[PDB]
């Protein structure tokens, strides 16, 4: 049997683009570990991906992971887009590079490490760990210390 683990994720961004941060909680046997960092210019959706990437990459063995997020962007990519990407070489139908391909490829690499069950929640109301992830992400966005070196500025 695989170790069973729970991960909760959220991103936060003060603009589009603007300062942003991610927040994640990894829970195993009651014990909780938190992850967060802040970036000077980024987007909310890139921070949503970073939260999942960082928490999954922390795992040192193959796990069964219950992954909970309210991000409709992450949900659309996981359930609607990534199957096209893997057939098309990570390009659009116009043979153009897909947006945020650097983070989507990193997330896909981390996801392939584990047995993943996704828990798509509707919001933060009633989900205390997801609310705490939002607090972690917002706190980092208010004290950014890194550059989002993979963000291709759109403006
Ligand atoms: Mg969010
Ligand atoms: Mg948020």
Numbering used by the authors: 1 to 155
The article reads:
The ribonuclease (RNase) H family of enzymes catalyze the specific cleavage of RNA strands of RNA/DNA hybrid duplexes and play an important role in DNA replication and repair. This catalysis requires divalent cations such as Mg2+, Mn2+ and Zn2+. Structural analyses found that the DEDD motif coordinates the divalent cation at the active site, acting as metal ligands, and constitutes the pivotal scaffold for the catalytic reaction. In addition to the highly conserved DEDD motif, a histidine adjacent to the active site (His124 in E. coli RNase HI) in the loop structure between β5 and α5 has also frequently been discussed.
In the RNH_Mg_3 data set, two Mg2+ ions, designated metals A and B, were observed in the vicinity of the active site, and both metals adopted a nearly ideal octahedral coordination with the surrounding acidic amino-acid residues and water molecules. Two of the water molecules coordinating to the Mg2+ ions were shared. H2Oδ− made relatively strong interactions with Mg2+ at the B position and Asp70, with O–X distances of 2.20 and 2.61 Å, respectively, while the O–N distance of 3.45 Å between the imidazole group of His124 and H2Oδ− suggests a weaker hydrogen bond. These detailed views are in good agreement with a scenario involving a His124→H2O→Mg2+→H2O→PO4 carboxylate–hydroxyl relay mechanism, as proposed by the previous NMR analyses.
